[PDB]
């Protein structure tokens, strides 16, 4: 997260952190007991943890839950070279213990499009600078969403990629305030509600206004996939 | 076909004739020959026949091998909201007797994107007007491939929908050329390449300037997904 702050611990209880590999983390959100969405780009192996109620990464905390992963669900229409429907789901082996400290984050009901203007929230424990690594604390920043049209732009994405109708963009005007390397997965909420998943930037310029953070929409159809995957 | 004129008789044999009911048709490549490729949108039922070595729709043909369908394979990432990945591979229940009047178009090697300014074209039995019905004889009509980024336009599809990296579209300027209701299905030929699949344009308005055709192109992840369902 770039131009956030750290969260009070333990205030956004429906955070996940991925915990990946030596190199990498994602984050994502606890959506049922035993389900957690992210993004599909974001790749575990067999040591890959889902830890639930963190705040901070390394220090030992009675809330944290370390979950595994039963089954990994990619979304079968992710396109990497688009970045289009950049979704997983995670099966867990258990289900998490729901608590103070770790809630499901509950599905919009109508998958629409956010309007330009609105502010939004993400959180994570990725990058705060463009460089060094991931923060030890969960941390949060606010950003607006930015017209989908702009976003295409000479002055931003310039078709490489395309942000399409699955896409929503979200920053500043101005810049400074982001995702970034490590925030993947990350649940992107607006006005109280799940709006999207944090998807991707421009590589080494988390914050530079020509790339407002890109979040995969939770739309009609990956909605529709969602609910099917889960129940049954 | 907007703008075109009558084929030679039976000088695109790769041709396919969907005859879905009484009030819809569609065209399709013979692409091997037990498959055509069409566009998913095209809805076939029980009745639906698929006319090989066709020029007349009406006229009885010695050149007419009347095919059926064995398996509908419509792409799994067909999305009917954006318009993207309109594709379907109609498997047949025996094999086109190959000759000269019922080839095989191949599909391209590389899935590029093709470059604004290519002249293309695009045959079918659709409508010649933006009225009445569809054409008894197959036609023909060249088109220049529209920078996307113009297709994307105030002045054209303005994000209704969005036309992406996986999408061409092709037209004139000045209009009038065009392929309309009825040609979903029917490939496009740039520079003797197969190129892309017929999909939409802007309803009663074939060959509005506006409104260039956009055609689904045969990228990478296309060619993929047909080449898999084909062999295996
Ligand atoms: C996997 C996630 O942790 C990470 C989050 C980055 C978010 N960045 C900003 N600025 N909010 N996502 C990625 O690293 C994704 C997946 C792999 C590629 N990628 C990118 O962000 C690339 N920079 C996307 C890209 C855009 C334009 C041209 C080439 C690549
Ligand atoms: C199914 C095909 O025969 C047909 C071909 C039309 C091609 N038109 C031009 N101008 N070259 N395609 C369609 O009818 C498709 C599938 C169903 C919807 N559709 C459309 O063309 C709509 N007009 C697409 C559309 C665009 C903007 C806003 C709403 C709908």
Chains 1, 2 share one sequence.
């Not at 009675?62 to 950049?86: H, N, S, W």
């Not at 942000?163 to 982001?178: E, F, K, T």
Request: proline letters at 5%.
């Amino acid at each position: 997260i770039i131009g956030g702050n750290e969260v009070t611990p333990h205030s956004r209880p429906y955070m996940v952190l991925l915990s990946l590999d030596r190199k990498t983390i994602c984050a994502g959100a606890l959506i049922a007991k035993d389900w957690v969405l992210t993004a599909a780009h974001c790749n575990l192996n067999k040591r890959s943890q889902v830890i639930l109620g963190a705040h901070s990464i390394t220090r030992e905390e009675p809330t944290k839950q370390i979950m595994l992963v039963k089954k990994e669900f990619p979304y079968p229409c992710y396109d990497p070279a688009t970045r289009e429907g950049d979704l997983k789901l995670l099966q867990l082996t258990e289900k998490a213990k729901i608590n103070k400290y770790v809630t499901i984050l509950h599905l919009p009901k109508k998958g629409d499009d956010v309007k330009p203007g609105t502010m939004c929230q993400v959180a994570g424990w990725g990058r705060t600078h463009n460089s060094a690594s991931w923060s030890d604390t969960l941390r949060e920043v606010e950003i607006t969403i930015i017209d989908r049209k702009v976003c295409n732009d000479r002055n931003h994405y310039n078709f490489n990629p395309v942000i399409g109708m699955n896409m929503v963009c979200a920053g500043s005007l101005r810049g400074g305030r982001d995702s970034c390397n490590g925030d993947s997965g990350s649940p992107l909420l607006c006005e109280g509600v799940f709006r999207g998943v944090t998807s991707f930037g421009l590589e080494n310029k988390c914050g530079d206004p020509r790339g407002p953070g890109v979040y995969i929409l939770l739309s009609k159809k990956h909605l529709n996939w969602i609910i099917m995957t889960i129940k049954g």
